[PDB]
């Protein structure tokens, strides 16, 4: 996700 | 060298007929469009008619449109003008005149005052 | 065609002075310009260069931090700004034009120069074998010059130049690229060389041939002159 | 933690999109050059070229670092590295978008103001319009360096933090305006004006009608799904962020970079015949 | 009436034709059945020179085989360093409609002209850094078609009035005028001996002139249409001509007649430009279809093709040392061609 | 009528062109052949030189 | 690297020349070039004279006039002392924006003008050049046909069958005989033009008088249309 945190990690 | 020589001109009565003939030499007659040009005594050259390489396309000025017919014989290197119903205004020197370059649609200079590829002309009186 | 330098005069050490060279009678914008100086009893020393269109500049290491060169083509004028002046800078300064293209002759015209008085490495070295030669009119004479490096470039040119300074005049170009006679000079001069050793020869001396002859290399910056050979007549 | 049962789909999706971009842009760029070694290098070809370069930059610096990241569980590197990556991920968006806008304004200028001769010079391979598009793509990406750092999300990851009142809301909405909305309006407006001018003067009308519909439709269909989910996640604090389609649509931004070359390679006959002749 | 004079002229033509016919004992084609053909000739574009804005109409090599001058109808005249491709000078002309271009044998001057009816001489070597017009020669009534220096003071011109003239340059005066063509004189070339030159015109005729006597020596007439280009053979005893009839022809000044013709059924467009190689064994001709064909001048076999140009080949020339060919085109580029070992 | 002057001038020029002497074509052809072979070794287009002495290489 | 000091300076000179050529390239492209043709009886001299006044050597072979409309610059050329043969020198103009062809519509000589136009239109090098056609001296034509003393059908007998086209715009309130005459003469040129244009070039007829100020606007509007079609071609929209 390019300009925002992804939902998962 | 390229040379053209017209013949068959002369006096004829109004309503009479003539055949002009042009003999061509020194070029591959079949590759060139050819024209007839005339000069009435008081004026410059005027174009009369032309015929394409094949004899397919033909055209005339309106002053002759129904009265004259042009034809060619690519087997004999000769060009004809059948003239019928001649009129006093048709009195002129008639010239046989080649287009300058082969295989082309245009011909600019055929009526110019000193064009090179044009015959000596023949007088017709009416 | 003329060039005339102005400014100069007497300056205190550490002072600053501007020289100006004003061109007239030629297409000044199309020429590169050089400054060359001559200490009062010494040979020539190249100082600085400004290209046509100002795209390239070079300096001698003795001035590299101290002087700046600039030009104004609309006013056909050339400036040298000097700072931190030293006794070493006491010299005549000459303004010299040059134009570079295939077959051109650089350094072909020199100004009259302004005198300036200051109160009180990998460079190719050019050697001229004699400081003076005694000569007579009608005599044939030859001057020799020698280089620490071969001046024959792989393109086949030999970048050697010869200048004459007459005792009352600025230098004059005699020969360019070893063999080409300058436009104005008599056909009595001729030039030859090996690429490392070179000779100027005069077929028949005349009274105007008296003076000091300087060779110069143009293979690399800095440009370097010989010490000069006098003819005594 | 994450289930590989879904993470495998993210890795597969990015792998498919990566090859689709890389192959399609490389192919058209090669054919363009295969012609471009000849004469007749027309100004339309300059824009088609630089568009493909912007789309390869999307492949090499947006998609590939995301895949290499997401194939691992965490960004395995220092903050001084990640900031550069997060910056370069964003440049691809602005470049790919504004190349289309620049190309469309030039077509409008060429046809709706035929007598206006542009004063400034050009190369064979560059124009000032293209350079402005690149220049803005670099400038606008800079805030990524302030947004992202290695942070103690918990042991650490490369992570974004926002001042709460402005929040994600202000930044994410600004991206949507800059990349999606305004270019669509600009492209549509210019194409409408070209149609009106030609119609006021037909196969040229017909081809204009075909390409205007394709461009504005396909552009919206690529961007609208991605930005819809991105804005929703930014505005709704309880969106279904973990939901499989939500997670997948969050990745899909580069889809537009796949379709761009086939469109303009279809309409440019000089390129279309070059693809048919391989 | 002139008919007697016509008959006398026709009688003289018959006499000349019979005399020339009696000399045609055997053809060049029969004699050259002994020699080996040249084989395939291949040449590569070693340089492309570009910078003109419009179609290039003419070019000429300097005698050093390294400097080259070129003229285009955007109104620039450019001098090129052939080895480096550096531009040495760019000269803006007073009239855009330039049609001819020449480099003085000393390299001190270039000459230029066209539809202005004026031939302008530019001094390249002056105390100032700039090229300027030395002289403008005016007195032709139609456009300038060709010009060539004899030396730094004498230049020969031909024009669209059916005339050539020899000029002093120090005074802008026609020292001699040559008259007898009946069409536009299209091209001109000087013999190496420089005492003679030949001109070809839009009357399908070529004429041999004596620059000192001021008179037509001989007339040659084999072509069927306008002669666009002419070139002396290096021996000076023969010359070649190219026409809109799509043929070249070779004439010998002493057999007084056509030796040979170069043509092929696939070729149906006019020839713009002609030159020999240094040995004379190759004849190069540029065509309206924008190839150049290389002909074995002795066997009349076609032996090679130069095929890089995108539009009408307007001019070509071979360096005096024979080292290279240059060709110019309406595509606005010059290309330089050389063989390979 | 001035045209007779042009015809006179043409007839006079045709007289000059008739008076010249002419060699047989076999002699002319032999001269051209002999020239080409005598200079064949020094034509860089007929016989290309090595790249070490082609100024236009590369 | 390998260049000498003087060789580097020679390259620097060559780059400044290119910098100058790139500058005046902008002037060259921002200017439209026009060839003006017409016989001695045509009014073309009055057109250039009027146009030279309203906007902006004894054997001179060519003449030029400069004029400007809406800040667009036009150079218009007409030949001076050239001979009547033109098959060679006309090839110089293969790259003008348009040819302006001027005809005296009252000398029904018209056949000579038709044959001239036919040669220009069909020539190998001038094809792809559009022709702007000024049918001039319309005031003389009106008076001549109203006097009835001389009949067009003496020269073009098909004029007995020609009938005024429904496109005809007799806006002056002209007599319908004048209208039928005008459009007949116009249509004889269009007969030639439509026979071979192949969509590569077009003819733009205008009825004109020597006094008419509008001629500069006419040329501008037609050049706009010519250049617009050229762009549509190279942008591959056409
Ligand atoms: C500060 C906020 C409002 C953002 C402003 C961004 C604006 C100023 C920038 C972003 C991208 C830029 C453009 C994209 C490319 C072109 C091509 C050029 O041929 C015309 C201008 C044009 C259209 C630029 C105009 C200015 C532009 C639209
Ligand atoms: C012209 C207006 C409408 C748009 C201009 C762009 C502005 C709003 C953009 C450019 C850079 C962006 C920012 C840079 C980084 C941060 C860090 C974050 O912790 C708080 C918000 C903040 C400060 C962003 C807010 C939005 C921002 C300031
Ligand atoms: C963030 C903002 C500033 C970005 C704006 C981008 C778009 C909408 C802007 C940039 C340049 C603008 C245009 C450039 C010039 C013209 C000419 C005019 O006759 C019709 C509209 C048109 C085509 C404008 C439409 C809007 C436009 C395309």
> What residue's CA is closest to ligand 1, atom 2?
D178
> What residue's CA is closest to ligand 3, atom 17?
D190
- Residue G14 with chain E: CB contacts under 8 Å: 86-88
What whole-number distance in Å separates Cα of residue C94 and Cα of residue C226? Answer: 17
| Best of D140, D180, D186 for a ligand 3 pocket test (most atoms within 8 Å of beta carbon) | D186
Contacts of E130 (CB under 8 A, 6+ apart): C27, C30
Q: Does G5 sit within 8 Å of C101, measured CB to CB?
A: no
What whole-number distance in Å separates Cα of residue E69 and Cα of residue E76? Answer: 11
Angle at B112 (CA atoms; ends B110, B118), nearest 5 degrees: 50
Pick the closest to residue C17 from C81, C78, C94, C110 (CA basis): C81
Contact partners for chain C, using 3 or more CB pairs closer than 8 A, are E, G
The whole-angstrom distance between D4's CA and the closest CA on chain G is 50
Question: How many CB atoms neighbour CB G17 within 10 A?
Answer: 18
What whole-number distance in Å separates Cα of residue E18 and Cα of residue E28? Answer: 19
CA G87, G88, G94, G100 torsion-angle sign? negative
Contacts of C112 (CB under 8 A, 6+ apart): C3, C4, C5, C94, C170
Pick the closest to residue E67 from E57, E58, E79, E77 (CA basis): E79
Stated length of chain D: 278
**What's the DSSP call for residue D180?**
I
Pick the closest to residue G205 from G138, G141, G144, G145 (CA basis): G138
Q: Find the domain containing G202 and state its range.
A: 32-234
Q: Is the peptide bond before C222 cis (omega within 30 degrees of 0)?
A: yes
Backbone angles phi, psi at C198, to 5 degrees: -145, 155
Pick the closest to residue E184 from F1, G61, G42 (CA basis): G61
Stated length of chain C: 233
Contacts of C194 (CB under 8 A, 6+ apart): none
What whole-number distance in Å separates Cα of residue G129 and Cα of residue G32? Answer: 13
What whole-number distance in Å separates Cα of residue G229 and Cα of residue G231? Answer: 5
Pick the closest to residue G101 from G37, G33, G197, G185 (CA basis): G37
Confirm if G129 and B117 have CB atoms less than 8 A apart: no
Chain E CB within 8 Å of residue C156 CB: no
What whole-number distance in Å separates Cα of residue D111 and Cα of residue D193? Answer: 10
Q: How many domains does chain E have?
A: 1
Burial of E260 (0-12, 13-18, 19+ CB in 10 A): buried
Confirm if E287 and E301 have CB atoms less than 8 A apart: no
Structure tokens at B39: 């000069």
Residue in the block written with tokens 């994410």? D172
Q: Does D208 sit within 8 Å of G234, measured CB to CB?
A: no
What whole-number distance in Å separates Cα of residue G46 and Cα of residue G136? Answer: 11
**What's the DSSP call for residue E115?**
T
Q: Ligand 2: residues whose CB is within 6 Å?
A: D 143, 146-147, 162-163, 166, 170-171, 174
What whole-number distance in Å separates Cα of residue G14 and Cα of residue G8? Answer: 10
CA of D233 relative to ligand 2 center, distance in Å:
18
What is chain C's alpha carbon radius of gyration, rounded to the nearest angstrom? Answer: 18
**What's the DSSP call for residue C158?**
B
Q: Please report the residues numbered 153 through 182 in chain E whose beta carbons come closer than 8 angstroms to any beta carbon of chain F.
A: 180
Pick the closest to residue E211 from E143, E139, E255, E155 (CA basis): E155
Helix-helix angle D64-71:D4-36, to 10 degrees: 160
The whole-angstrom distance between G8's CA and the closest CA on chain C is 9
CA of D171 relative to ligand 2 center, distance in Å:
6
The CA distances from residue E57 to C149, D206, E144, in Å, are 48, 42, 13
User: Can chain F be said to touch chain D, i.e. do they have 3 or more Cβ pairs within 8 angstroms?
Assistant: no
Contacts of E194 (CB under 8 A, 6+ apart): E150, E211
Helix-helix angle D203-235:D255-267, to 10 degrees: 170
Q: Does E268 sit within 8 Å of B2, measured CB to CB?
A: no
**What's the DSSP call for residue F9?**
H
Pairing mode of beta strands G31-38, G72-79: parallel
| Chain G nearest-CA residue for E228 | G88
CA of D254 relative to ligand 2 center, distance in Å:
24
Chain G CB within 8 Å of residue B56 CB: no
What whole-number distance in Å separates Cα of residue D134 and Cα of residue E201? Answer: 59
Q: How many domains does chain G have?
A: 1
| Helix runs in chain D, H state only | 4-36, 43-58, 64-71, 79-112, 128-140, 144-147, 167-175, 182-200, 203-235, 244-249, 255-267, 269-276
- Residue E245 with chain B: CB contacts under 8 Å: 27, 101-102
Structure tokens at D121: 């010079």
Contacts of E50 (CB under 8 A, 6+ apart): E332, E333, E334
D13, D140, D250: best to mutate for the A interface, most A CBs within 10 A: D250
SS3 E60: strand
The CA distances from residue E278 to D227, E43, E291, F55, G181, in Å, are 73, 16, 21, 17, 66
Contacts of E229 (CB under 8 A, 6+ apart): E186, E187, E200, E241, E242, E271, E272, E273, E274, E285
What whole-number distance in Å separates Cα of residue F1 and Cα of residue E237? Answer: 41
The CA distances from residue E204 to B4, B100, B118, in Å, are 14, 10, 13
Helix-helix angle D4-36:D43-58, to 10 degrees: 160
Confirm if B94 and B37 have CB atoms less than 8 A apart: yes
Confirm if B15 and B86 have CB atoms less than 8 A apart: yes
Q: Which residues of E179-188 are buried (b: 16+ CB within 10 A; e: fewer)?
A: ebbebbbbbb
Of E84, E88, E130, the CB nearest to C27: E130
> What residue's CA is closest to ligand 3, atom 10?
D186
CA of C208 relative to ligand 3 center, distance in Å:
77
Q: What is the DSSP string of chain B?
A: --EEEEE---B--TT--EEEEEEEESS-GGGS-EEEEEE-TTS--EEEEEE-TTS--EEE-TTTTTTEEEEEETTTTEEEEEE-S--GGG-EEEEEEE-SSSS-S---STTSTT-SSB---EEEB-
Pick the closest to residue C100 from G6, B49, E83 (CA basis): G6
Q: Does D73 sit within 8 Å of A9, measured CB to CB?
A: yes
Structure tokens at C114: 């302004």
Pick the closest to residue E223 from D215, C145, B1 (CA basis): B1
SS3 D20: helix
> What residue's CA is closest to ligand 1, atom 19?
D129
- Residue B42 with chain G: CB contacts under 8 Å: none
**What's the DSSP call for residue F15?**
H
Domain layout of chain F by residue ranges = 1-58
Domain layout of chain D by residue ranges = 1-278
Structure solved using which method? cryo-EM
What whole-number distance in Å separates Cα of residue E235 and Cα of residue D108? Answer: 62
CA of D173 relative to ligand 1 center, distance in Å:
18
Confirm if C131 and C229 have CB atoms less than 8 A apart: yes
Q: Tell me the HSE value of C167 on the side-chain side, using a 13 A CA sphere.
A: 9
> What residue's CA is closest to ligand 1, atom 18?
D129
Pick the closest to residue G124 from B103, E186, E160, E74 (CA basis): B103
What whole-number distance in Å separates Cα of residue C159 and Cα of residue G75? Answer: 50
Q: What is the DSSP string of E239-275?
A: EEEEETTS-EEEEETTTTEEEEEE--TT--S-EEEEE
What whole-number distance in Å separates Cα of residue C22 and Cα of residue C5? Answer: 7
Query: CATH second-level architecture of B3-124?
Result: Sandwich (2.60)
The whole-angstrom distance between D21's CA and the closest CA on chain A is 17
Both ends of chain G: CA-CA distance in Å?
Answer: 50
E204: left (phi over 0), alpha (psi -120 to 50) or beta: left
Pairing mode of beta strands C132-134, C229-232: parallel
- Quick one: which H or E segment has residue G228? helix G215-234
D136 lines ligand 1 (CB under 6 A): yes
Burial of E33 (0-12, 13-18, 19+ CB in 10 A): exposed
Confirm if D100 and D214 have CB atoms less than 8 A apart: no
Confirm if D162 and D171 have CB atoms less than 8 A apart: yes
Structure tokens at F3: 């045209």
What whole-number distance in Å separates Cα of residue D155 and Cα of residue D153? Answer: 6
Pick the closest to residue F53 from E323, E319, E84, G4 (CA basis): E323
Chain B CB within 8 Å of residue E182 CB: yes
> What residue's CA is closest to ligand 3, atom 18?
D190
Provide the resolution (angstroms).
2.6
Q: Does E54 sit within 8 Å of G88, measured CB to CB?
A: no
What whole-number distance in Å separates Cα of residue B106 and Cα of residue G84? Answer: 16
D189 lines ligand 3 (CB under 6 A): yes
Q: What is the DSSP string of G131-200?
A: EEEEEE-HHHHHHHHHH-SS-GGGT-GGGGT----TT---TTT--HHHHHHHHHHHHHHHHHHHTT-TTT
Confirm if E289 and F44 have CB atoms less than 8 A apart: no
What whole-number distance in Å separates Cα of residue D59 and Cα of residue E290? Answer: 44
Cα C185 to chain centroid, rounded: 17
Strand partners, C68: C81
SS3 D112: helix
E75: left (phi over 0), alpha (psi -120 to 50) or beta: left
Contacts of G213 (CB under 8 A, 6+ apart): G50, G54
What whole-number distance in Å separates Cα of residue F44 and Cα of residue G33? Answer: 44
The whole-angstrom distance between E127's CA and the closest CA on chain C is 7
């Amino acid at each position: 996700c390019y300009f925002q945190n992804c939902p998962r990690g | 060298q390229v040379q053209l020589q017209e013949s068959g001109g002369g006096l004829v009565q109004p309503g009479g007929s003539l055949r002009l003939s042009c003999a061509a030499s020194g070029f591959t007659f079949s590759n060139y469009k050819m024209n007839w040009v005339r000069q009435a005594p008081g004026k410059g050259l005027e174009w009369v008619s032309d015929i394409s390489q094949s004899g397919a396309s033909i055209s005339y000025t309106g002053s002759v449109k129904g009265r004259f017919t042009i034809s060619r014989d690519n087997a004999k290197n000769t060009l004809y003008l059948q003239m019928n119903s001649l009129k006093p205004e048709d009195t002129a020197v008639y010239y046989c005149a080649r287009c300058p370059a082969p295989f082309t649609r245009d011909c600019f200079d055929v009526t110019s005052t000193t064009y090179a590829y044009r015959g000596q002309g023949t007088q017709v009186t009416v | 065609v003329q060039l005339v330098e102005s400014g100069g005069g007497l300056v205190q050490p550490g002072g600053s002075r501007k020289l100006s060279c004003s061109a007239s009678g030629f297409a000044f914008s199309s020429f590169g310009m050089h400054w060359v100086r001559q200490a009062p009893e010494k040979g020539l020393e190249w100082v600085a260069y400004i290209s046509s269109g100002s795209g390239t500049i070079y300096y001698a290491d003795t001035v590299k931090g101290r002087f700046t060169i600039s030009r104004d083509d609309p006013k056909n004028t050339l400036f040298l700004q000097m700072t931190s002046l030293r006794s070493e800078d006491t010299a005549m300064y000459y303004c010299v034009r040059s134009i570079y293209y295939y077959g051109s002759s650089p350094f072909d015209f020199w100004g009259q120069g302004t005198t300036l008085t200051v109160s009180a490495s990998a460079d190719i070295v050019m050697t001229q074998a004699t400081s003076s030669v005694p000569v007579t009119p009608g005599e044939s004479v030859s001057i020799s010059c020698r280089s620490s490096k071969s001046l024959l470039h792989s393109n086949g040119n030999t970048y050697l130049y010869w200048f004459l300074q007459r005792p009352g005049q600025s230098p004059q170009l005699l020969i360019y690229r070893m063999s080409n006679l300058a436009s104005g000079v008599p056909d009595r001069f001729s030039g030859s060389g090996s690429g490392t050793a070179f000779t100027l020869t005069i077929s028949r001396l005349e009274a105007e041939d008296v003076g000091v002859y300087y060779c110069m290399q143009h293979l690399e910056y800095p440009l370097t002159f010989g010490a000069g050979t006098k003819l005594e007549l | 933690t994450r289930d590989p049962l879904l993470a495998r789909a993210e890795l597969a999706l990015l792998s498919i999109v990566f090859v689709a971009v890389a192959l399609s842009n490389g192919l058209v760029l090669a054919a363009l050059a295969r012609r471009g070694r000849r004469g007749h290098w027309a100004p339309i070809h300059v824009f088609i070229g630089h568009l493909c370069l912007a789309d390869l930059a999307v492949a090499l610096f947006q998609v590939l670092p995301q895949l290499a990241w997401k194939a691992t569980d965490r960004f395995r590197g220092p903050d001084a590295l990640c900031r550069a990556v997060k910056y370069l991920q964003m440049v691809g968006m602005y470049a790919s978008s504004y190349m289309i806008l620049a190309m469309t304004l030039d077509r409008h200028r060429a046809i709706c103001r035929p007598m206006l001769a542009y004063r400034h010079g050009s190369g064979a391979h560059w124009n000032r319009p293209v350079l402005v598009a690149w220049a803005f793509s670099l400038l606008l990406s800079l805030p990524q360096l302030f947004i992202f750092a290695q942070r103690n999300v918990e042991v650490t990851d490369c992570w974004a933090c926002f001042a709460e009142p402005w929040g994600r809301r202000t930044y994410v909405t600004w991206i949507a305006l800059m990349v999606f909305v305004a270019p669509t309006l600009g492209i549509a407006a210019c194409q409408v004006l070209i149609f009106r001018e030609i119609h006021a003067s037909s196969a040229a009308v017909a081809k204009t009608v075909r390409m205007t519909l394709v461009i504005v439709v396909v552009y919206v269909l690529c961007w609208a799904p991605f930005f819809l989910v991105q804005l929703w996640a930014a505005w709704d604090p309880e969106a279904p962020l973990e939901g499989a389609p939500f997670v997948l649509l969050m990745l899909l931004a580069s889809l537009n970079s796949c379709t761009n070359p086939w469109i303009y390679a279809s309409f440019s006959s000089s390129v279309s015949s070059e693809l048919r002749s391989l | 009436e002139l008919d007697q004079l016509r008959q006398e002229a026709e009688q003289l033509k018959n006499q000349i034709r019979d005399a020339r016919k009696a000399c045609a004992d055997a053809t060049l084609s029969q004699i050259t059945n002994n020699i080996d053909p040249v084989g395939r000739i291949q040449m590569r574009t070693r340089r492309t020179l570009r910078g003109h804005l419009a179609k290039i109409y003419a070019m000429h090599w300097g005698t050093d085989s390294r400097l080259l001058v070129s003229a285009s109808q955007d109104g620039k005249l450019i001098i090129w360093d052939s080895y480096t491709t550096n531009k040495v000078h760019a000269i803006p002309l007073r009239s855009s409609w330039v049609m001819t271009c020449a480099y003085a044998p000393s390299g001190n001057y270039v000459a230029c002209g066209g539809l202005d009816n004026i031939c302008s001489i530019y001094n390249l070597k002056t105390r100032e850094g700039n090229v300027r017009v030395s002289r403008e020669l005016a007195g032709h009534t139609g456009y300038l078609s060709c010009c060539r220096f004899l030396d730094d003071n004498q230049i020969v011109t031909s024009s669209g009035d059916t005339t050539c003239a020899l000029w002093d340059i120090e005074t802008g005066q026609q020292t001699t005028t040559f008259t007898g063509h009946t069409g536009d004189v299209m091209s001109l070339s000087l013999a190496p001996d420089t005492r003679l030159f030949v001109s070809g015109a839009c009357d399908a005729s070529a004429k041999l002139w004596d620059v000192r006597e001021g008179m037509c020596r001989q007339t040659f007439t084999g072509h069927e249409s306008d002669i666009n280009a002419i070139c002396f053979f290096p021996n000076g005893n023969a010359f070649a001509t190219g026409s809109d009839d799509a043929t070249c022809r070779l004439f010998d000044l002493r057999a007084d007649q056509e030796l040979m013709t170069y043509s092929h059924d696939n070729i149906i467009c006019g020839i713009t430009s002609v030159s020999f190689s240094k040995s004379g064994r190759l004849l190069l001709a540029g065509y309206d279809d924008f190839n150049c064909n290389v002909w074995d001048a002795l066997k009349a076999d076609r032996a090679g093709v130069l095929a890089g140009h995108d539009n009408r080949v307007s001019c070509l020339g071979v360096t005096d040392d024979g080292m290279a060919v240059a060709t110019g085109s309406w595509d606005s580029f010059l290309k330089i061609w050389n063989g390979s070992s | 009528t001035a045209s007779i002057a042009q015809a006179r001038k043409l007839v006079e020029q045709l007289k000059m062109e008739a008076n010249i002497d002419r060699i047989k074509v076999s002699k002319a052809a032999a001269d051209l052949m002999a020239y080409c072979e005598a200079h064949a070794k020094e034509d860089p287009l007929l016989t290309p030189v090595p790249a070490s002495e082609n100024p236009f290489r590369e | 690297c390998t260049l000498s000091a003087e060789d580097k300076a020679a390259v620097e000179r060559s780059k400044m020349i290119e910098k100058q050529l790139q500058k005046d390239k902008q002037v060259y492209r921002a200017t439209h070039r026009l060839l003006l043709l017409g016989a001695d009886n045509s009014g073309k001299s009055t057109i250039v004279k009027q146009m030279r006044i309203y906007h902006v050597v004894k054997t001179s072979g060519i003449f030029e006039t400069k004029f400007q409309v809406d800040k667009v610059n036009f150079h218009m050329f007409d030949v001076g002392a050239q001979r009547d043969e033109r098959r060679k020198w006309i090839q110089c103009f293969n790259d003008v924006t348009a040819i302006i062809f001027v005809v005296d519509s009252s000398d029904y000589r018209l056949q000579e003008a038709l044959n001239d136009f036919k040669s220009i239109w069909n020539n190998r090098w001038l094809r792809t050049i559009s022709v702007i056609l000024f049918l001039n001296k319309q005031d003389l034509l009106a008076e001549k046909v109203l006097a009835g003393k001389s009949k067009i059908e003496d020269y073009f007998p098909e004029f007995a069958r020609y009938t005024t086209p429904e496109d005809a715009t007799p806006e002056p309130g002209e007599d319908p005989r004048v209208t039928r005459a005008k459009y007949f003469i116009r249509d004889e040129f269009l007969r030639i033009s439509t026979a071979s244009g192949d969509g590569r070039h077009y003819c733009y007829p205008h009825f004109t008088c020597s006094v008419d100020t509008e001629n500069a606007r006419r040329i501008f509007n037609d050049c706009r249309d010519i250049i617009q079609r050229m762009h549509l071609r190279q942008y591959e929209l056409l």
